Design a protein around this ligand. Sequence first.
Ligand SMILES: [Zn+2]
Ligand SMILES: [Zn+2]
Ligand SMILES: [Zn+2]
Ligand SMILES: [Zn+2]
Lengths: 58, 46, 567, 100, 115, 105, 473, 193, 33
Amino acid sequence: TATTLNTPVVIHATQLPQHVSTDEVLQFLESFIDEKETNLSSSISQLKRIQRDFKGLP
Amino acid sequence: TTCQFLTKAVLDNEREQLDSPSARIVVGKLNNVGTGSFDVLAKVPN
Amino acid sequence: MDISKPVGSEITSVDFGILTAKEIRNLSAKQITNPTVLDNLGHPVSGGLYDLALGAFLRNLCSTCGLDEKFCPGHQGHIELPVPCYNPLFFNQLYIYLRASCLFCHHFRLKSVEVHRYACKLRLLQYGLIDESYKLDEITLSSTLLNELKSKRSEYVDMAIAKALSDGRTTERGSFTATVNDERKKLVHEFHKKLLSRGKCDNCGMFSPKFRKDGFTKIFETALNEKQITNNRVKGFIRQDSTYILSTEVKNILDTVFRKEQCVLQYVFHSRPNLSRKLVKADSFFMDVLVVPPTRFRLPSKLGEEVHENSQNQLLSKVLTTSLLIRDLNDDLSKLQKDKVSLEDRRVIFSRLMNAFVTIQNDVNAFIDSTKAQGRTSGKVPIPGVKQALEKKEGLFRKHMMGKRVNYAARSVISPDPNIETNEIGVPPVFAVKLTYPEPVTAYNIAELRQAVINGPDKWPGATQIQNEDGSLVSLIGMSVEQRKALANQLLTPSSNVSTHTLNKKVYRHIKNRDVVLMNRQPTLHKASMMGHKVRVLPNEKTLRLHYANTGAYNADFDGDEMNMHF
Amino acid sequence: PEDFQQHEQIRRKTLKEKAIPKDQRATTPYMTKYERARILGTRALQISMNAPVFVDLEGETDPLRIAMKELAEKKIPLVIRRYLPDGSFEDWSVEELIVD
Amino acid sequence: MYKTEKVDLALNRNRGDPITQHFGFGNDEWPKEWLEKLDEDGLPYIGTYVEEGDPICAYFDDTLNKTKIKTYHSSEPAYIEEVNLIGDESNKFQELQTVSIKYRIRRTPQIGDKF
Amino acid sequence: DRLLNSSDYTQASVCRECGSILTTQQSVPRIGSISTVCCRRCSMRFEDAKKLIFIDDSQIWEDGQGNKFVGGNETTTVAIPFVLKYLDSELSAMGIRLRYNVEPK
Amino acid sequence: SAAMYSRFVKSALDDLDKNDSTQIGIIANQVALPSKNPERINDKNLNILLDILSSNINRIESSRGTFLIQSIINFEKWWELPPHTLSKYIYFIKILCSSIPKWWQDVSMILVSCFILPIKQTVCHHDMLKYFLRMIPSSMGFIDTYLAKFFPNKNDTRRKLVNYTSNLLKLRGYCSELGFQIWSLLIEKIISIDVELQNELGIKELSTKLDSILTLVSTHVEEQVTPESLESGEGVGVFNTLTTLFKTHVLPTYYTRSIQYIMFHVSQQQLELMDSFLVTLIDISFAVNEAAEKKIKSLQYLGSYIARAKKLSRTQIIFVASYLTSWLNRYVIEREEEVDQRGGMERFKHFYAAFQALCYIFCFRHNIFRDTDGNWECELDKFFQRMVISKFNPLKFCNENVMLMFARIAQQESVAYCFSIIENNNNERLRSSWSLATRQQFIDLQSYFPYDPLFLKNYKILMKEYYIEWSEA
Amino acid sequence: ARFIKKHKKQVTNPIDEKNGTSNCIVRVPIALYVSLAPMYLENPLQGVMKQHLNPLVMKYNNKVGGVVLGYEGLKILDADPLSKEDTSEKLIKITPDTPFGFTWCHVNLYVWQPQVGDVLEGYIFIQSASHIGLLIHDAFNASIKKNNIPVDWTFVHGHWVDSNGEPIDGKLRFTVRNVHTTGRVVSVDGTLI
Amino acid sequence: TFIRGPICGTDNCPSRLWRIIDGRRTCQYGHVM
Ligand SMILES: [Zn+2]
Ligand SMILES: [Zn+2]
Ligand SMILES: [Zn+2]
Ligand SMILES: [Zn+2]
């Protein structure tokens, strides 16, 4: 479970969230997936599935 | 005379700024004297 | 305290204030109503003082969090007082404002203009503006002039604070030094003296009946004197456009005065600017509920084999009985019409009510406070109330903060030794084998700590246990040499867990010559009676050995005097 | 939410204006006996938990001794923040302070 | 040094009450190492070395249906010197409830002793 | 160490919002969910909160008795001497409130 | 009955829309009973209750419905239900966790805990795990921790342990992404295997335990790793994670007898697996960053491996000899000058470490280093002598028993003559200095050989094809 | 007079074109106060990533009110307020009691924040008489309860059938009723009325 | 050293608690909590 070693003491948004186009979501997924190549493995796997959908696939 | 001074603090809606040695011992804060009179920071490259 | 459990949040200041009956009711885990504490099978009575909502008790689990007597922090509940009581802490201040009041126009009997002059000064002092508060008095150019005077003093205070904020001299949080605090305290004293110094109200010209007290918090009202009743009806046309007095009457009087005189009170009751913007209410001097502290602060005691009830519970249950009893008086009281109904019962109902109020007020006094309680059965000596527990004997501060009972460490008769260094202390193996530093295991010490763990609890220099990365301890006590050799070979295995990956194991070793302890001989009247010595373990010794060069510092004689060794 | 950000920036800015220009520093260029002890202890603590070490251990097993060695060669990556009584401060690197 | 301790298991009983606890052993299953310190009566053999935690007494408790044991408490080991059976008056009939055990502690003179 | 470590060092929960160390408790969760740390002062009884927008799931917690609460999730832990808790407790018996200002907010 | 019960429940649900909740609770309580109590709801009625609940699960997704659901998830030994009824329970659970993902947490926990049961009895559990891992990939988190939580203890029954690993292997084969964490768990059991066996080298217990576990693990790996599986498969994945866990657990702790034979054995499945291991060992034993003790442990591993691993090719061996003499020749050329300078012979731990490994390798495989001519590969005749007479005086600082055996063999082969240097060495001894505070750990480290013979009955037999006993060499 | 009501779902998520769904992917800048372990003293960004950020990926986070997809542009705020935002040497204050640092950081989060009211599309993966189970973006769980499906829709043995008697399949368009976030993984409650 | 009670706070027992005066409480395999 959560300790000061794996969890931020506090988190705050500094701005209102800005919506992003599909073309942007794709450019971000692209680079984030590349840069990060057990929990992280199974997660980029899922991201890989999402980027697949944003390109229209299965 | 604990309860007298306490009564006075409450009626003043006082804030204990926690600067005295006594106050800091009460709340478990590192003393303001001594090796505690400055901060240490690490110089990190890259 | 563990260097591998850091804390991110930090307390930076503490604010003093008063619990409102609304807060209490909201936070409460259970309303307590039963004087009886246990049943025939020793279980907590529901709605009683050991009710399990207030925390785990004995075997039982806490009904609020579900935790055991060990991990359950306890939770507070409340008692509902069927009738308002004066908070015994504040009764003197209540007395001052009550006496100062005009029961007719509901201002203080001190002329409004003066009261405003005090409000101006105190407000300036919240910002530390001492010079300005004297300049305020320099302001002068009958009721039309006065409001212009009030007004121009007011615009001076604003201009001064504005100016003070623009340059360095203050923040919106105020400025509070000793010289400021001194000026503030004088003014409040001066103000209170002037409040009580008035007879006729300076504002409406009427006389209010005088109020008198007890040392047991009862308030009497002395009816009006002859000249004064005459004076009062002469002013009768302008207004057209002894006895015990209940705490409820007193509260109503102050409630209104606090509304009217709110401005001044806003600064009399705040040494700093009141950013919170909360009104100053009369209720603050009264209690409609009592906070029942958590069960873990009210446990029974065992005097050897016999078990004794908690004294704070004995006091709280007396509040509880009186409470039920008043809730019954209140029940029969409503079953009047007496639209029919013959008057005199009015006198007897009052008699019973006075009785209830007095004795609950006594029980509260006794707790804050046994002082405020009527001495029992002439003898016995009073039982300490909460006030006396916090203040009793030498007090929490002296008995548990200045001084403490301590845990790791040792004590022994000292013996002289010319053959150790003047900065060492000769430690007997009997100590050396039981005292451990918690040593964190690293590349640089894995050899050493391996050996310690192999050596075990009983061969010096050894070890008594291992702390794992998940904080858990493993005892080396019951163990064979092989089991120990096994644990010694897994001291430095990698992490199989991301959450503890930053930690290493710890070995609770025996101490050694590399080490430093703190030696102490009492009385400790200067710092050299508590110094750091380098450890030197000496075979076959049963006492602490100390070089002569240190007697001076410790004031030690070697006549069977003892020292403490702290590790 | 936008303005708490602003509030923080003001706090942090004034703190630095206490914490001050390098070239306007005015306290002793010597490391104090207190600063030394804490620097040693704290650096020793970091060594005990696998901080990258900037010197040859040469068989040392006491992390305090390792720190002392690092101090001697001026390889301790720590900075002392000295507070003046109004809360403003001067940052001094361990390497730049004269040690004795 | 000699210390005398009084073991009196009539300490709880409410005055001339039925007797719950009697010196001796029950027939339930209990350690057996116990007989190293204790004779059949549940009293300790005279002369026995006794260190902290050892039995100095064994009785059978009725309300527990178990055989229990008063243990030796000093951190300083000792030997059993006298064991006195303090019988009761008020004419016999009553069984053993009170015992005095006198311990003997060796003092070869130690560091810190005063002369 | 002595006050610090011997003394009665204790990691304790505070509500960052009301500044109390006495009104926090562990939530009691449904099976499968994880317990969280909540403030009894700063949270509404579930009924009363409905009676005044949609209410998120993470914002509800329950005690052992079974009452549901909304809010009171602004808690952390601070290191205090245990005897502080006792003093605060005694003070609240006398109707007095200590309010600890914790940082970071 | 049949239709009476259909009414009873149908009523209960109406009564639940009204909040009376009694009828349901009566039912729930009836299903919650233990597998033993005769009064627990029987199959036929349960068939009914289930098929009715599945048909409109939304009727139950309420606070009032919680208790009923909890009672069905907690149905004892459900995997033990009769075919037809078992099927209705499964369909219900399927239906439940689909409309309400929340309960998947509760269902899977119980599932994992059933991993202590034999393979034949778990099909349904895996079928369900496979299903919901797919549809709720986010679950992998907490369900991974379950893998931790419910691992049988070392004390617990062997059948429990052997089962709970059999299942984890099965799980691995349809939820790859958990694959590493799994292998990490088994290995970290790892430490218990290290516990079992070295000290002993009850004990009869740990033998057959640790023996049943390893033989399993390795046979599953023999199947998981195959050329077909290596080009297009997850064979690669398994080797990788087993090699990683070797570098992080086996090597350091580095006094294990159970356990390093997993790598000994997988290694020798295919030529490249061997290649990868050798070069991997070489890396660790000569990397500039690593701690000297790590370099010494690797070098022991390296030497033991080359000596023992039967499936090694002449040239892979000559490869290691060629690396060692090469690295050694350089050491002496660049460093001999540092000996008569200030310091001790410990400055050269690493030199002796490597020279040991090479000597050791020569003991077991000297018959190979003679090429067709009868000449020595790597000029071993000329090379050994040079080191033996160097200023490092290896013979004095390396393991005593190896240096002795090397002497014997080397002398026999006209390769080198050390025996006078040895004489001189223990003469100078009776009458080149190293502390001995730290000199012992080295003697300790040089005494351990991670692939000296195994003492576990079965594993031994299994290893024979992959092992060279001293008698063989 | 009192506003705890600043935990009210303000998503707003816009409807799309050329399309009909709501775009719920959003980029939010955050500040976060985190610990830095001593092992990372030479790699502080690496350490902040491995300790704090990485564990946030593909989990719901109560503060950004959605699932965190990932992060860009991590920056440590130097405790030395006098340095330039440029320099690669920074100060991190060390705990009095422990060797751990604590610093503020700025980073950018990409968040999938489906609020109530939004229109989403899911891939049908399961059909009982009790609910329809969908997968949004082939990643997040959705579920339409039996009585959020319109009344004239019927069921068979199984698979659903609509208002006009034809079976439904694959992509389905629904509106967000509630978002459950406290379980192991996020789950969306959707409606068709 | 026995008291049987309090099983063991380690889910690979539960093996069987004796308390030492130092308050570790010790279970046979050798958890000290
Ligand atoms: Zn509790
Ligand atoms: Zn008046
Ligand atoms: Zn709160
Ligand atoms: Zn255990």
